[PDB]
Curated annotation (Swiss-Prot), chains A, B:
Function: Glycogenin participates in the glycogen biosynthetic process along with glycogen synthase and glycogen branching enzyme. It catalyzes the formation of a short alpha (1,4)-glucosyl chain covalently attached via a glucose 1-O-tyrosyl linkage to internal tyrosine residues and these chains act as primers for the elongation reaction catalyzed by glycogen synthase.
Organism: Homo sapiens (Human)
Binding site for UDP-alpha-D-glucose: 10, 12-13, 16, 78, 87, 103-105, 134-135, 161, 164-165, 211, 214
Binding site for UDP: 10, 12-13, 16, 78, 103-105, 208, 211, 214
Cofactor note text: Divalent metal ions. Required for self-glucosylation. Manganese is the most effective.
One cellular component term from this protein's GO annotations in UniProt: cytosol
Gene Ontology molecular-function annotations: glycogenin glucosyltransferase activity; glycosyltransferase activity; manganese ion binding; protein homodimerization activity
Binding-site positions, Mn(2+): 103, 105, 208
Name of the featured protein: Glycogenin-1
Keyword terms, alphabetized: Acetylation, Cytoplasm, Disease variant, Glycogen biosynthesis, Glycogen storage disease, Glycoprotein, Manganese, Metal-binding, Nucleus, Phosphoprotein, Transferase
Enzyme class: transferase
Disease: Glycogen storage disease 15: A metabolic disorder resulting in muscle weakness, associated with the glycogen depletion in skeletal muscle, and cardiac arrhythmia, associated with the accumulation of abnormal storage material in the heart. The skeletal muscle shows a marked predominance of slow-twitch, oxidative muscle fibers and mitochondrial proliferation. Polyglucosan body myopathy 2: A glycogen storage disease characterized by polyglucosan accumulation in muscle, and skeletal myopathy without cardiac involvement. Most patients manifest slowly progressive, hip girdle, shoulder girdle, and/or hand and leg muscle weakness. Polyglucosan contains abnormally long and poorly branched glucosyl chains and is variably resistant to digestion by alpha-amylase.
Residues where Phosphoserine is found: 45
PTM description: Phosphorylated.
Amino acid sequence: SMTDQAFVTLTTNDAYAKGALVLGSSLKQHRTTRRLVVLATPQVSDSMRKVLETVFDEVIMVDVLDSGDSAHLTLMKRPELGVTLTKLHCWSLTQYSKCVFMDADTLVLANIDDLFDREELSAAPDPGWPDCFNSGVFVYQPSVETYNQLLHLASEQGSFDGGDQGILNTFFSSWATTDIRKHLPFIYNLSSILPAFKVFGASAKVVHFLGRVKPWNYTYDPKTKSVKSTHPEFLILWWNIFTTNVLPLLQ
Amino acid sequence: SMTDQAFVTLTTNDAYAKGALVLGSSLKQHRTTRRLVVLATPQVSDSMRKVLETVFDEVIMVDVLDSGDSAHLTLMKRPELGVTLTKLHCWSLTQYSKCVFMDADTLVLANIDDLFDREELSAAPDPGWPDCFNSGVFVYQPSVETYNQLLHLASEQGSFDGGDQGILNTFFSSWATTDIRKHLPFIYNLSSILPAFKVFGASAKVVHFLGRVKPWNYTYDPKTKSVKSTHPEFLILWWNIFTTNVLPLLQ
Ligand SMILES: O=c1ccn([C@@H]2O[C@H](COP(=O)(O)OP(=O)(O)O)[C@@H](O)[C@H]2O)c(=O)[nH]1
Ligand SMILES: O=c1ccn([C@@H]2O[C@H](COP(=O)(O)OP(=O)(O)O)[C@@H](O)[C@H]2O)c(=O)[nH]1
Ligand SMILES: [Mn+2]
Ligand SMILES: [Mn+2]
């Protein structure tokens, strides 16, 4: 293995846990040589953690509601940010020298181990405001200091969008205008939100299921091998990995 | 003046001509020291050209249907690209050493003369596929050679999107991964297509009315000083410039 480097994701409940299982399975399918880590909350059932342990190398419990937790004081100032402050613990994983964070609503389509050639903070442009990076996929260097700086910003300013992206863009404010290599190609975080896709979509490495309805919210029908009601192949691939690679794992 | 440098736009009919008048007026309002040039087709009425001559320094006729025109042979190979091939004549303006091209559906909100500090090809990211630049605002160096290269590409490949953006991104294919200074801030070409706008929208320099319905397609009502049926201030500002600055110009 590479014990030094990891893909890291986050699950705060059993639903998003299904995303992480598909994500993690997709990274394994494409033969990552890196470690797979999921940050989990106590809202994730013990039974679902057990399933998570079959795909991830580490299942690391984070509970911001605990007074022992580093973020707990910040949560009391900003109680609307529990999920965000949990995600930012990704910077506390100081046993790793470099990590790629990935949202549980991502799916990997090709080997993306070359991301570890990048430096903090490397991320793809967000559609809709492309001078902000999308926080669903980013390369970072674990650090207690950086983590504590991020907590402080969250304390002072909250997030301009109620999630982690605002706060990450505010702290990492030089991304839009400094060093192009920190701009991940859009194909490493391709929002499922048209003629450009016909030309470039085939080279997609990561698809990101941005928005309200997540792939596990759909009703899957084995009879038709698809869901009840743009490029629907990605949603179908999600459920292929789920039914094929994930389902037989704890038995 | 600066006789060396110009803002350049394009009008193929009387409708888009109204956009160019508002654009040009907005550049004058914000006190550009550069020259204002509009490329016009014979589909633009002589009476509307006369109004255009009150705002622009040069009204340059381009007719791709003419056998004397440089693009005419390319048009016969690709007859669906008349508008595109007309726009690309912007590169034929070799009397200027550097130009900013702007679509007739842009409106300037602040002085953007600092764009002339940039080099070919400097453009803002397109929302939706942000590793392509949006072709509504770009800094370029006039050149017969570049122009002829662009014609050839148009001949060989057409455009992957039926307009000029595909062809410009294909020719200028290194934009996404080389030299960040060629990435215009999104505020220099802000698509009217939300929490990021609350934080960053106020610093907008150029708004771009992307999409089907253009500002002059709206019915303006002087009684209410707004239109019949997101951030509606931009559309209202368009019509303010039209009614205030443009309307009294030929009398
Ligand atoms: O209720 C939640 C909210 C978010 N997350 C995690 O935080 C990330 C960011 O949220 P989300 O992906 O739902 O936002 P979006 O990507 O749609 O903008 C998710 O991918 C998860 O890893 C989670 O586990 N549970
Ligand atoms: O019928 C047309 C089509 C386009 N154009 C010019 O070409 C540009 C690009 O087209 P458009 O702005 O309509 O495309 P969009 O910006 O909406 O994607 C316009 O701004 C105009 O300057 C024009 O004059 N007449
Ligand atoms: Mn996400
Ligand atoms: Mn336009």
